[PDB]
UniProtKB/Swiss-Prot annotation:
The gene is MB. GO terms for biological process: oxygen transport; removal of superoxide radicals. Its EC number is 1.7.-.-, 1.11.1.-. It comes from the Eukaryota. O2 binds at residue 64. It catalyses: Fe(III)-heme b-[protein] + nitric oxide + H2O = Fe(II)-heme b-[protein] + nitrite + 2 H(+); H2O2 + AH2 = A + 2 H2O. This is Myoglobin. GO terms for cellular component: sarcoplasm. Nitrite binds at residue 64.
């Protein structure tokens, strides 16, 4: 549960992402894969990437970063009223991709890391608080659907 002022902060931060969605999406995924190499094994289309240079050179990885962040941005713009947008993603991630909730924690922290890396000094403590709360709400509503499905 976020206040109006917290949502305003989230959507202000998101404007930074929308100015370069592919560059942000690429870096989020590279941070996830290099920090947590087990996550790469869930992607049949990226498992061939052995080095970070190959990851950086991959145009399909940048494409997928755009898909991921476009979906997250659509959810965030709903300011918590995201049941219809979140349900299919929870279902596909539990039943088809088999993504444990832990990996959603990993990517949430990766988003925070990338925002500080690309905007040092321009991602303030209030903005980090609100973004963190928004990602926690997203993860928590997914977790509820995972529990319904019995997925661990
Ligand atoms: C911010 C969190 C995330 C968002 C918004 C997101 C969004 C999406 C979307 C929109 C798709 C395509 C449609 C679909 O299959 O439902 C996708 C595919 C996928 N997601 Fe996620 N995702 C997230 C996190 C993750 C994480 C943490 C992993 C794994 C570590 C992951 C693994 C996958 C895989 C394996 C695919 C299929 C890729 C394919 O082979 O082309 N997702 N995701």
């Amino acid at each position: 549960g976020l206040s109006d002022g917290e949502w305003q902060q989230v959507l202000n931060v998101w404007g930074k992402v929308e100015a370069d969605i592919a560059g942000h999406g690429q870096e989020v995924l590279i941070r996830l894969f290099t920090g947590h190499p087990e996550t790469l094994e869930k992607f049949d289309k990226f498992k061939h990437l052995k080095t970070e240079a190959e990851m950086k050179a991959s145009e399909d990885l940048k494409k997928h970063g755009t898909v991921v962040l476009t979906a997250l941005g659509g959810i965030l713009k709903k300011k918590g009223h995201h049941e219809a947008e979140l349900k299919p993603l929870a279902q596909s991630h539990a039943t088809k991709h088999k993504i444990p909730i832990k990996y959603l924690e990993f990517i949430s922290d990766a988003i925070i890391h990338v925002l500080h890396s690309k905007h040092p000094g321009d991602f303030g403590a209030d903005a980090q608080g609100a973004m963190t709360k928004a990602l926690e709400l997203f993860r928590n509503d997914i977790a509820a659907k995972y529990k319904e499905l019995g997925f661990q």
